[PDB]
Design a protein around this ligand. Structure first.
Ligand SMILES: CC(C)=CCC/C(C)=C\CC/C(C)=C\CSP(=O)(O)OP(=O)(O)O
Ligand SMILES: [Mg+2]
Lengths: 306, 254
């Protein structure tokens, strides 16, 4: 290869740890609680690779990667307030620890640390025209995620078309990926064709990740793709009860759950979901081939492979 | 009546030689941030799910539309600085709001109270002045004037909100300024809001029984707010900014 290959996920952690280190107080303490433990940090990792994949600078993509981390943690800290399915492995919710008002302010401080970190990209050398278009990309993507999250709450206990669900999770998971790739590609100086490719890669990989989440239950009241594909195939009589249990509000969820795995298994909803997920992974790798060959494009391609 | 920020942003932009076609989409953008911020304020004061996410969405709308000022013809170098100004203002408010939740049931220092409302109310106005002035092409001296003006105007109106209750129970400047001026009445002031089991309508009358001092503090900041305007060049927009200093006839409700 002609370009280098850094260790992205470890570099971002050093930058976030530097900005909000151990021992912070005030609002920084609530910001740090949301950030740590760090974990994979795939969002920021995706932005830097997307920036470097088109010729960008690490120094320009780095503050935007912190911005990506802050916005994602801000959205997670607020989503924990309105949604409550506490997996016994889930990190204790910030509202459980600090109280609901502090989780509200804390998530907002994370959002504005994001905007402030993205504002620093100008100081890092990016042209002012690029920083503003990055904010436009960042802002529009966040609006897609927000709109999808609300329809996710509203569409619970209801059966929807399979295509509506795909459009649903694309605006939540795909926009979450596009926000990293679109801002990374923008600051890297990508032309319109590369940004469209990174947009296609984001949408297609985002569908795959969303389906993968539906599958770990089978490998809430939320409609999932295996149930939806199973409903599509089941004859009329099984379709009604599939609808009536999800519509049901006063029947044990544990029995509705196991009475749902029976329908998904009977009509191969789980396997049908993998093939749909497989179809979109192939479209994601296809989209990447537009980008110039590099280790960064290789890193983005490997990410599709489970 | 309405929020000072939209009007305050436009006058700030035009007072430094700015364009109206730039300030108009920006003030719309500025409203989105403030309106979204208030949606979250209604939750810390106690539908909540739609209010949380919809409040978040208005922040993104504010920055999207602030970037949209490139469509209005604004120099991208000014818009870039507007992002920096707006972002640091939200950080000041968030730190101030956090201190507020952690100030209840406790008498604080006056200087600690002024900085809180300065970082809360002043930065909220600075969120309007600073963004507006930036998109108007102000130099560093004008932006300084707008900073001190917004901080001093925010304090003054924050006190006026404190007075309106006397003519809830979180400490206000009159309660504090009354405390600082005997030892026994220092205790009496502290216990009642710390107190958790008592009639609210009575601790209200018992607390009323410093407010005039709050007006002198408020007046001192109105002068500082007006002095900061002198750093700006004389114009109708600067005169309109002096008009807002005198209380006038506003809503005066939350
Ligand atoms: C992180 C962030 C951006 C904001 C956190 C704080 C929130 C949610 C709202 C603050 C509202 C402001 C800035 C001023 C109204 S004080 P007032 O006395 O005029 O009226 P009020 O107290 O709002 O009734
Ligand atoms: Mg309030």
């Amino acid at each position: 290869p002609q370009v280098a290959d850094p260790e992205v996920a470890a570099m971002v952690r050093a930058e976030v740890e530097g900005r909000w280190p151990l021992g912070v107080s005030g609002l920084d303490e609530v910001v740090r609680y949301g950030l740590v433990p760090f974990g994979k940090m795939m969002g920021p990792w995706l932005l830097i690779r997307s920036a470097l994949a088109v010729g960008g600078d690490i120094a320009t993509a780095l503050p935007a990667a912190v911005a990506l981390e802050c916005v994602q943690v801000g959205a997670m800290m607020h989503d924990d307030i309105i949604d409550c399915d506490a997996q016994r492995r889930s990190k204790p919710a910030a509202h459980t620890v600090f109280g609901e008002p502090t989780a509200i302010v804390g998530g907002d401080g994370l959002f504005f640390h994001g905007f402030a970190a993205l504002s620093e990209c100008r100081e890092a050398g990016a042209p002012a025209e690029r920083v503003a278009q990055a904010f436009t990309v960042l802002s529009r993507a966040g609006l897609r995620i927000g709109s999808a999250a609300l329809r996710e709450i509203r569409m619970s206990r209801e059966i929807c078309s399979v295509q509506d669900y795909l459009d649903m999770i694309a605006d939540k998971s795909g926009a979450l990926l596009w926000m990293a790739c679109g801002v990374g590609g923008t600051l890297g100086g990508a032309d319109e064709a590369a940004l469209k490719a990174l947009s296609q890669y984001s949408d297609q990989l985002g569908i795959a990740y969303a389906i993968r989440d539906d599958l770990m239950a089978y490998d809430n009241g939320r409609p999932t793709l295996p149930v939806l594909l199973a409903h599509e195939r089941a004859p009329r009589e099984q379709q009604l009860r599939i609808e009536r249990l999800l519509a049901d509000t006063a029947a044990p969820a544990a029995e509705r759950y196991k009475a749902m795995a029976d329908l998904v298994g009977a009509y191969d909803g789980a396997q049908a979901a993998r093939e749909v997920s497989h179809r979109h992974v192939q479209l994601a790798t296809r989209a990447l081939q537009t980008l110039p060959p590099s280790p960064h494009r290789d890193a983005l391609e490997d990410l599709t492979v489970p």
